[PDB]
Subunit: 323 residues, 4 copies
Amino acid sequence: CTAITYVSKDHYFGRNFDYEISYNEVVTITPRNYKFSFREVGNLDHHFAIIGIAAGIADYPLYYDAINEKGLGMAGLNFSGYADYKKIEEGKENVSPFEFIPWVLGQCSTVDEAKKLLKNLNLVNINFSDELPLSPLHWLLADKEQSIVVESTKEGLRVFDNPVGVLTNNPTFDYQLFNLNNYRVLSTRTPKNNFSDQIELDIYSRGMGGIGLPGDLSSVSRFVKATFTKLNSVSRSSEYESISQFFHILSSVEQQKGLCDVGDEKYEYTIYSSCCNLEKGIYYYRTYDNSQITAVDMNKENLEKDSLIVYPMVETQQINYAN
Amino acid sequence: CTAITYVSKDHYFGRNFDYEISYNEVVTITPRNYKFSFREVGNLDHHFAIIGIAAGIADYPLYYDAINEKGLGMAGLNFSGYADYKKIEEGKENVSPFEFIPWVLGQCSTVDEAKKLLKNLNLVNINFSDELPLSPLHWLLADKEQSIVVESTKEGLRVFDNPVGVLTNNPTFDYQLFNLNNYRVLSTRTPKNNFSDQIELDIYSRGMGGIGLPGDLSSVSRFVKATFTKLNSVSRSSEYESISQFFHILSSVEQQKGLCDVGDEKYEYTIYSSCCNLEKGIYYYRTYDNSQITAVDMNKENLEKDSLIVYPMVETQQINYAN
Amino acid sequence: CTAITYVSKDHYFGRNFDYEISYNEVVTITPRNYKFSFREVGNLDHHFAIIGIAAGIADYPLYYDAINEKGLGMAGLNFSGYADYKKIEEGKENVSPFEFIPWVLGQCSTVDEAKKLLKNLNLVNINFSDELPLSPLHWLLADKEQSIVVESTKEGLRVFDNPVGVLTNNPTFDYQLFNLNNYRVLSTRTPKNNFSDQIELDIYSRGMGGIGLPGDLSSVSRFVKATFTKLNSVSRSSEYESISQFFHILSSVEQQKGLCDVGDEKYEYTIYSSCCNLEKGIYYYRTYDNSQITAVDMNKENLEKDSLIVYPMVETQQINYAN
Amino acid sequence: CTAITYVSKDHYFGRNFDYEISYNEVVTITPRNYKFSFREVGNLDHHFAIIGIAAGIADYPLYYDAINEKGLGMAGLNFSGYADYKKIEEGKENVSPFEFIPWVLGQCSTVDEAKKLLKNLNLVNINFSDELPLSPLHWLLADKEQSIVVESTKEGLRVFDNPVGVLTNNPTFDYQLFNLNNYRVLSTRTPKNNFSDQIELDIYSRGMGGIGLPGDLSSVSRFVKATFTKLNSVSRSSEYESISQFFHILSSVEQQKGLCDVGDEKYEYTIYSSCCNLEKGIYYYRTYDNSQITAVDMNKENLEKDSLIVYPMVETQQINYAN
């Protein structure tokens, strides 16, 4: 999994969802008056509207990622073997990971508001049902000003400021940030010959400033490549050019089918990529077998409704036959 | 630039066209009776029909890459500082690099036929009575059985069998193949802990078998990454799943705008990606700011015409607004 | 700096001391009745004898590394920006870093004993003198059974089991161990072609299993290279062969003069390398300009003395002129 | 195998000899009137004196490397699968690879003189005996002005100017030089943060400018590391400081025993390292288990003799017991 933020006049938030198999992912808009019931904290009968992509092997919006109508986004990413969820703890806001995106996005308009809410959070090991046990996750949250990372591990709950607006999978975020220090010399420009002033070395290709950038599909390597690609990206400050660049950033760390054999005949691959415009409440996505970008605009729905609005994803290639 | 072949059930051929600017690329179908005139070899008044992307700035089809109606494809890729074109030589077939795609694809139905035609080729330093735009190039050719690489350098003309169906930019192809030896251990599966049997090392991420794969945008790194990605790709044999995988393979080595700063506020980036179905005569492409796949089928045109059939490329983002 | 352990029938402990300036280093044997006075904990009037290399100032043994007569070793290595020393704390054993090697090695015969002593250590920010402020350091300790690492940072005092018997400089030891996970595939044997079963890749050199091993002189890269080299070393279980292999392991991560420019035309380089036999109480060393190994055997001295026994180091190249 | 040149005030030439076993290497001085008999070219009854290390399995001086009394040096390095020796060719100087060092060093005082002699060379496939078939080799030659590389492959005989004064094993020398282009950015100084101006990246270690330098024991990685370590080396002009730096350079690419398992409980490892002073006719060496430098000075022998002067190598550890 890879989640990023990117700004090009509007603030975009989105992710590659990387997994072995596709479980009826759908675009779900949760309107303001869809009541959220929580297992161990108070209910939210009226809250901010949310749009995201959800699993939807249930009626409840089981989001993988989403944004709300105020421009706060949140994404859960795989954190296998590092995630640690806790016993109910008296005096904390005991929230299950499956409730966590609704809990935050329902009531917070900004990352700063989320940080205050996270001060008393305890992420509890309460399954949605015995049918649907918890995934091991960590989270990226982002608004139009900043992003943070939330990690609940055996050591406890940590909330990090994210200076690069990227998250992937394991290990913990402090390690991910640290490892970037090893890549300081990488450049978008022609590297100087520091190797020796006594010999001529030839620039036989463009792009040589990036040599050392890792290209494998592992978590830490994707973190470095996404970060370098994100921070050095350029694009016009127009919607279509901006989201194009965003999906190019996510493409740079997508996982092609066949390359990550997880055993059986199974491969981890990038099932979908999303790009959310935080200002405009638009969720864009592409899927592995549909390269055309599809847009769902939360503001075209009636956000005072009580009922989930669910759209299927376009998963087959939409080709322009030009003749 | 990156060109590849990939077989599912059909045989596909195509490329990333990487450059600093998009300037009037078009899809040009050259019908059978559009006369090809050549400066130093005999004319081809009647020939195989061809479909490709060309530089729209000439009245003649100046192809970057193309396929013919018999399933033979050819692509010219940048080879700056390596390409060497020659004086007219008595007894050779003297063909300019700008004539070379029409020369081959006009009259050859297979790669084996092209090898025979290439036996007395001399690639000559001509554009008639002026000095030289002539781009420094080398070529990938491919049919439904095989691919080869054609390089004219200061050492002479070499035609290589291509065991991996990939080409990029500099250096020479024997070096590109040789360099693959350094990557033999890379795997799609979980790597064994060979480092030491005395310590426990954790598989904290999927994809770790690929560690060592280079992820910078230089020519040799893109050759390695495209090759590893192509050879380990998997897809269903359906047209749509096949071309999807094809464009994924090309995406793995695309150049995102901003990452290769060539000076003057310019960047080398992937202006378009093509995928051609050799069996069906269909040219598919995506452009940097249009993620939707566009298809142009040569067999829908009148191939007995005398005149070029030219389609502009769709270069603005084609979004499916689903609500 | 790099410190290691290595076993080849005897248990060896030692280090490269890497720095831009020598502080007049000597071999110092501290006998059993040289009284150790401590600033904030009880004195050790009678203790285990110790041999090591110390900064040559003739009033207290300021050890860089040392071993005692019971086979326990300890080394201080640079930890700049990471080391944090503390205020005096009531209820702790408040020991200055300059006292720390005498404190441990004076009274502990094993690493397990040192772990018990460290349980209530607080490493306090008390200078030897105003003329010689504390260095930022961390420590490796090793006996004939195991090794540990001791790190006092802004988060607190941590004592790690060291499963590889290696330490270098920054960052913290948990990151150093974790990073080894990225190197699991590295092998001393011929790597298999996992890259693709469809092409032939040639083993054109020996040693190709190690591709990926980093060769720069930075802390993390030396940690990885030293660890791989140490764990995969072989040697006869005879003294001369064993210590030869030891010095080969240290040579693999030594810093050549000219390669680490630290600014004022000063260079960080490996001033000396040591190898101590824990069973025999022998301190062997080589120096940057003296490749011959020199041996100082603590057991040849009178260990009941009151006074430091100091040997100057052999620093000039000792050549065998054979004709 | 690795051979280098290095200049301080004197010009030095030497090599690591890397192989699976040590069997009777000796230092052999060939005096001026030891007759060299050649299989297919004229004899050299009187020639320059030569000192080097040879295989001590024949009466004939089978040199691995050597220098002559005029300051020309030559080394044969393993080139397995690349070396190609030829049939006897009329009108060439047909010289066997076992004769080649004597042939050159016997009659040439400079590299320019060797280039002239090599114009008509044909390296022929004539074994020393059927018991001892030819090794696949290539050669480095060096005088007090320059060095060159000699490679006889299936493509023919090539003589390259060597701008870096380094050679290892496979592949061909043009590739080795080319590959150095990939390392241009490596520096002995602190690298700038070019990765992104928007984030702070910490220089947590010295020596970070070398990151990317390969540290495995394979031929191409050793070439790069040796070249970087040689060109950026510094030392005082004294003989002893000069040869120490030289042996430090060679140490940086030595092969530790255990790390290159070639099967059968055998390892490729650095059996000896040499350093020759070209001006003074002194052959210095160290062996895997003898870290002390040993020196054999050709000018202390009677160079008018007829007979080989042979010194066994010191191969057991020479320790200075200071106590």
